[PDB]
Structure formats: C-alpha cells, structure tokens
From a paper:
Phases for PpsRN-Q-PAS1 were obtained by MR using the PpsRQ-PAS1 dimer as a search model. Since the dimer arrangement of the PAS1 domain was virtually identical in both crystal forms, we obtained excellent phases and could model the remaining parts of the Q-linker and the N-domain into the electron-density map. The PpsRN-Q-PAS1 dimer has a barbell-like quaternary structure with a protomer crossing along a central imperfect dyad axis. Owing to the protomer crossing, the N-­domain and PAS1 domain of a single protomer are located on opposite sides of the dyad axis. The functional relevance of the observed dimer architecture is supported by a large number of contacts, which lead to a total BSA of 6180 Å2. The PpsRN-Q-PAS1 structure also allowed the identification of an additional PAS domain in the N-terminal part of PpsR, which was predicted based on sequence information from some PpsR homologues. The PAS core is N-­terminally flanked by a helix (αN), which again corresponds to a classical PAS N-cap and constitutes a central part of the N-domain dimer interface, in analogy to the N-cap of PAS1. The highly conserved Q-linkers form a ∼57 Å long coiled-coil-like structure which connects the N-domain dimers to the PAS1 dimers. However, neither tailing nor a reduction in the elution volume of the eluting peak was observed during PpsRN-Q-PAS1 purification, suggesting that PpsRN-Q-PAS1 is not able to form tetramers even at high concentrations. Additionally, the observed PpsRN-Q-PAS1 dimer organization appears to resemble a general architecture for the connection of PAS modules with a variety of effector or sensory domains.
The redox-responding transcription factor PpsR (photopigment suppression) from Rhodobacter sphaeroides is such a multi-PAS domain-containing protein. PpsR possesses three PAS domains (designated N-domain, PAS1 and PAS2) and a highly conserved glutamine-rich linker (Q-linker) as well as a C-terminal helix–turn–helix (HTH) DNA-binding motif. PpsR acts as a repressor of photosynthesis and tetrapyrrole-biosynthesis gene expression by binding to palindromic DNA sequences (TGTc-N10-gACA) present in the promoter region of PpsR-regulated genes. Additionally, the function of PpsR is regulated in a blue-light- and oxygen-dependent manner by the antirepressor AppA that, together with PpsR and its cognate DNA, is able to form a light-sensitive ternary AppA–PpsR2–DNA complex.
Author numbering:
A (entry chain B): 6 to 91, 98 to 257
B (entry chain A): 8 to 257
The structure:
C-alpha cells in the first residue's frame, strides 16, 4: 500500500501522472495549473491562473462541463468527461471536501488524434494507389485489345504466351483461352522452345534484320514475326508483332 | 490544499491510466487500476510477485537502467515498457518513475500505449499494401507504354474530363502532323479544323455509345490530312478515357 506522502510530493505525483491538471474554485476560477514537466507543449498555461475555466473551453465544452459537474458531490467518487480547450482532453473530476473546489486530472488526447489523422492519410494513400493501379491496368487492356496490330506477349524464361489480342488470335488460328499459357514455339510448325527463343532474342537485338518466317499450325498461315525485348518488373518479356506473309 | 491519504491514493490512481507500486527489492506491491480507464484485465495476480516476471527481457534491462540511479526527492524518469499479461500477450506502457523516500519503493505512473501501438500497426500494414499496389502499377505501366508505342494502329488517348490528350503513339503523331511533345496536354478538338471542345467531345461520346463503324471525318490542322476517327470510351476508377483510333481517309 501507499506510504505517507508530503504535500510537495503529492503535487508532483499528480502533475506527472496527468498531462495537465487544474484546480478550480467553487466560483469557477482556475486557481492552479499543474502541467507535466515531461509532457510537451504545456507550461505556457501560466496565464490560465486567476481566469474563469469557461474562458478556456469551447461553447460545447462549457455546457458539458456544467452538466456533468453540477451533480458532482465531494467525497469518494470521481467522474470522467472529454473536453475541448482553446485541443481535446479527458478529464477525471474530483470535488475536494473543504471548499467545494474541483480538481481536474487531464489526459491529453492529441497523441491519439494525431495518429488517427495519420491513419486517415494512410487510407487515402491506399485509395490513390489502388485507383492508379486499376487505371493503368485498364489503359494496358484497352490499348492491347483494341489495337488492330496483332501482338503477342511472351515470357522469355517460360517461352509461354502471357497475353495477346484477338487480332493475333485470328492470325494464329486460336481463341484466347486456347492461346494464353501456350508455348509460343509450339504454335509454329517445325519450331521448338530452345532454338525459337534464341532466334527471337538475337533478332530483337539487331534493328536492321528481317522478321522470322513461320507457319501457324492452327490457321496454316505463313506469318512474319517481329520481336522486341523489354523488362517489366525485373522479368524479361518478348513483344511480338505478327503480319501475314502471303 | 491539504489531502487525506485515502483520497491521495484515489487521485493518483485516477491521474494515471495504470500504476504500480514496486518495493526497493523489486517485488510488485500494488497494482492500481484506474476505474475510468479501459480494462487491462485482472492484473491483481501480479501483486507480491517480482516485476521482472511481467516485463519482456528488453524491458527488464531498460527498467533496471532507468530506475537504479533514481533518488527520492531528485525528480522522476520516463520509461516505455512492454508488459506480458497472464495470457502471454504483450502491451506497451509509458511510465513515469518516482522513488519514494519512506522506503525507497518505486511508484510507476503509466499512460496506456495500446491505442497508439494499434494505430501504428495499421500504418505499417497500409505501407505494405501501398508497396504491393505500386509494384503492380509499375508492371502495368511498363507493359502499357511498350504496347502503345510498338502498336502500328494509330491511337490517341484523351481525358474525358478535360478533352485533352493524355497519351498517343507515333503513328497517331504522324497522321496529326505533330510530335509527342506538342500533342501531350493539347485539346483534341483544336487539332481539327472547325471543331470545338464541347461539340466534339459530345459527338465522340455519343458515337462511342452507338457502337458504330461510322467514323468522324476531320481535317488535321498541323498535317492538313483528312482523317477518320473512331472513338471508344472506357471507365476506370471513377473517370473516363476516350480512345481515338485514327486512319487516313485517303
């Protein structure tokens, strides 16, 4: 249990547990301000002393203080109320027995309000990144799908079709679901994964050289394939434009 | 103002969110709850047991360093500590330590850090979500840029909101008679003789909605070429994109 505590130490304990503490007379005048020597900001509230508590509360807080305080009788009890100064504060109120004065023990709510504000910013940032990602995905789909230039997108490591448009589908002789994930070499008669990917890669590396001549299995069309290599998110992709050769 | 010992305990228990009284030898002597502050659970079982039992390893060391030099009447020290509750869940408290003169016990006055840690955990989670969404945008943007630029189909992307060009490829640049640098940001309607933003954007939106093969015939100002424009409209993330497909008319 708590041993005996000198008045000076009791004042210091209270002042340090609370962020801001007020002694207020029965008349409603701020008799003493005790601010936490550890807690930031406060301490310029020297000026609050001698002045009406109502002078440092919003309209809404005054009425609220009045209501919750009128009932408060001096004894074993306390009551809690959130108030706003000219910043938000949780006060626990005690009425002292000798002169009906009110001791208000304040817990500063600015730190929690501050992190909430950050969370609000965080959440708006996520909305922005999500919308912008969807906007880019849509531009990508739109440009690729509407384009009359037959194009196929191929993964350099797997040799598989990762995307294409319907114009490529027509020239290749297949529908989207057949062609997505299909090994590109295997769509052309006589080609195999190894040598075909090496051909495209070498081709893509020189601007002056002709396209590759292939025969599409499904459509039985001779086609000219023109490959371009680029990096997307680290990964190497081949973008091939295809034309009828005959 | 002078105060009786019982009220003094009550003032101190209600000024802190939670407070502990620890003997000089390190045994928890009292856990004082603040009845107006949100519950920490039943922590009364801490009483009569060592403080070291209820702190993480790092906090034990930290409490040692902060408190050991602390003298009575010689001020107080702030320290943030991680507790481990009887159910093995951790919770953070910022304490102010005083050493009491009568017996050299330590009175620890706590501010609850749970709501701050909770929000901070949400902030870290949000960063992670943003990062994943950013990387995905880079992939899409890279693909979009290469596809648009490589495509021989002449295309101009127009903002529905402003009627200004937001992108195009060089096949479109050639037909319009301009370089990228001059066309980006430019009002699309003003590229074409006798056309105006309001009527032109309306015509494009209405035609797109009709799903028609009939183009708009226009005369490009810079190149003086007769062109055929087929619009399509796409909606993403609460705004619209007008895609103009362009062909020479002759």
């Amino acid at each position: 249990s708590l041993p005996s505590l000198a008045p000076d130490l009791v004042r210091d304990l209270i002042a340090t547990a609370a962020d801001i503490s007020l002694l207020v007379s029965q008349e409603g005048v701020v008799r003493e301000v005790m601010a936490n020597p550890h807690h930031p900001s406060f301490g310029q509230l020297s000026e609050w002393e001698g002045r009406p508590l109502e002078e440092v509360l919003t309209a809404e807080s005054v009425a609220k203080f009045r209501l919750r305080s009128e009932g408060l009788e001096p004894g074993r009890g306390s009551v809690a109320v959130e108030l706003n100064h000219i910043f938000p504060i949780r006060y626990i109120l005690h009425r002292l027995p000798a002169d009906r004065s009110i001791l208000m023990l304040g817990r500063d709510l600015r730190p929690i309000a501050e992190v909430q504000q950050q969370l609000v910013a965080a959440q708006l940032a996520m909305e922005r990144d999500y919308e912008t990602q969807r906007e880019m995905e849509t531009r990508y789909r739109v440009v690729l799908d509407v384009s009359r230039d037959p194009m196929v997108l191929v993964s350099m490591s797997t040799g598989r079709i990762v995307d294409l448009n319907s114009a490529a589908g027509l020239l290749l002789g297949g529908v989207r679901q057949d062609l997505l994930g299909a090994a590109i070499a295997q769509e052309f008669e006589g080609r195999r994964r190894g040598e075909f990917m090496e051909t495209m890669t070498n081709l893509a590396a020189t601007e002056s050289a002709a396209p590759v001549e292939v025969l599409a299995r499904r459509s039985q069309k001779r086609l000219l394939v023109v490959p371009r290599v680029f990096r997307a998110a680290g990964e190497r992709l081949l973008l091939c434009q295809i034309d009828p050769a005959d």
